[PDB]
């Protein structure tokens, strides 16, 4: 037999509208239509009737725009932060194929779509045909990006750190806030070097923090290891950093989204001595999605 | 513009720093095994020879005699106060002190050579450590000619 009906959604601007990609589990890359905060979502729900002769008794058809956060792969933990309904049909029958127009006016989409370890945040259209014991349901996923402009203030991070009477260094990264295709321009300056350093590297680290209060899991992922020095410096030695962020395709910083989760980035400077002892200093950076002109 | 050639500005390096000798020199050599005693209280001693230019060590050159128990004493002193996960020693060989083996026991040459290398392995990892250089036991061990356990 198969299914009695097949629900398809088609957006009015489905030719001209730009799509986007998302890295899911096991390296898969799904591509969905891109939307921005305040845009209207509108199109057609198309019901293809598959079994001619037969009839489809329903207690109503609707379409929902949904944006929700999912935690720990646990259906019971899902929280919808945006829900909009359009009733498409009263209780009735369907003998043949039909299509329904829908339009959600100027839809609020306060968060950027995210897929992480313990958190997903996704938007979708959910068409539902209500039936006596089991509803026919069709989801249609959308990416939403959240944009921003050049920040009012953007101070360079500059800091002396060390091990007392062994190693003193001053490091500097040119900004505190970097866009997703920006560049870490920085330097390391050696004030005192009484250890034998083999190499130094700059790492970019992604932390994903989930939960509330003492309920706090953190998932750390090291997105880049970038060697910046090879060999032992002396005092007065400057080491240039130029790390292009386009090569690692990171997400923006996301801070207390719906008071549920955060995702934050960190430049972890790591030196390593001849006996493989490892000295480090972590610094948060804000990543942000630049609005194209 | 075709290429991003951005760097932060740097302070030129002072010439005395650039060419003058580095401030991180530290080599320790465990060498020359010798049997001190006769009969039942025999033991091997090794010459622990230091060279350095770090200001935390009182002598830039020193040469002292040490026993495997002295290495065991040092590791026990650092394990208690220092909060440094201390590297292992080459091993207490009890079964080598047992009688009528097919080798010279604790004075076997392969054993002494392998012990000796493992002590140099140990002492260079411990003496290079930043937190271990602050402890008084390390300077007592390397640069005093006899250890004062009290």
């Amino acid at each position: 037999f198969g299914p009695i009906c097949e629900i398809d959604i088609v957006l009015n601007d489905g030719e001209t509208r730009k799509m986007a990609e998302m890295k899911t589990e096991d390296g898969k890359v799904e591509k969905h239509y891109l939307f921005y905060d305040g845009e209207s979502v509108s199109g057609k729900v198309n019901l293809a009737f598959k079994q001619p002769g037969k009839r489809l008794e329903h207690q109503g058809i609707r379409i929902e725009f949904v944006g929700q956060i999912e935690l720990f792969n646990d259906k019971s933990n899902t929280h919808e932060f945006v829900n909009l309904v359009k009733e498409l049909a009263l209780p009735g029958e369907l003998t043949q194929s039909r299509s329904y127009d829908f339009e959600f006016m100027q839809v609020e989409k306060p968060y950027e779509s995210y897929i992480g370890a313990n958190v997903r945040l996704r938007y979708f259209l959910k068409v539902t045909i209500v039936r006596r014991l089991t509803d026919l349901v069709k989801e249609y996923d959308l990416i939403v990006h959240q944009l921003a402009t050049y920040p009012d203030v953007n101070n360079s991070i500059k800091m002396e750190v060390g091990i007392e009477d062994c190693l003193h260094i001053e490091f500097e990264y040119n900004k505190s806030k970097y866009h997703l295709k920006d560049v870490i321009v920085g330097k390391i300056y050696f004030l005192l070097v009484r250890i034998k350093i083999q190499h130094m590297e700059l790492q970019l680290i992604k932390k994903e923090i989930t939960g509330i209060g003492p309920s706090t899991t953190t998932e750390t992922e090291t997105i880049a290891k970038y060697e910046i020095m090879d060999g032992a410096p002396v005092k007065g030695e400057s080491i240039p950093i130029r790390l292009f962020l386009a090569g690692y395709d990171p997400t923006p910083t996301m801070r207390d989204v719906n008071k549920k989760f955060s995702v934050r980035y960190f430049l972890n400077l790591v030196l390593v001595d001849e006996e493989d002892r490892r000295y480090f200093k972590q610094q948060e950076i804000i990543l942000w999605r630049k609005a194209p002109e | 513009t075709v290429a991003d050639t951005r760097r932060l500005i740097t302070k030129p390096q002072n010439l005395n720093d650039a060419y003058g000798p580095p401030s991180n020199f530290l080599e320790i050599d465990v060498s020359n095994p010798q049997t001190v005693g006769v009969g039942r209280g025999r033991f091997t001693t090794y010459e622990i020879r230091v060279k350095t230019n770090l200001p935390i060590f009182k002598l830039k050159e020193s040469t002292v005699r040490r026993r495997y128990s002295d290495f065991e004493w040092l590791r026990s002193e650092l394990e208690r106060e220092s909060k440094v996960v201390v590297p292992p020693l080459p091993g207490k060989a009890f079964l080598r002190q047992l009688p009528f083996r097919g080798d010279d026991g604790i004075f076997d040459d392969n054993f002494i050579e392998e012990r000796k290398q493992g002590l140099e392995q140990f002492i260079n990892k411990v003496a290079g450590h930043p937190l271990a250089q602050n402890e008084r036991c390390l300077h007592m061990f390397l640069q005093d000619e006899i250890i004062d356990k009290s």
């Binding site: 002396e160 750190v161 091990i163 190693l167 002892r277 000295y279 200093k281 | -």
Partner: peptide, 11 residues
């Protein structure tokens, strides 16, 4: 296994 040491902020 690998010895990590946080670099202290200097006065």
């Amino acid at each position: 296994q690998p010895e990590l040491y946080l670099l202290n902020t200097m006065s």
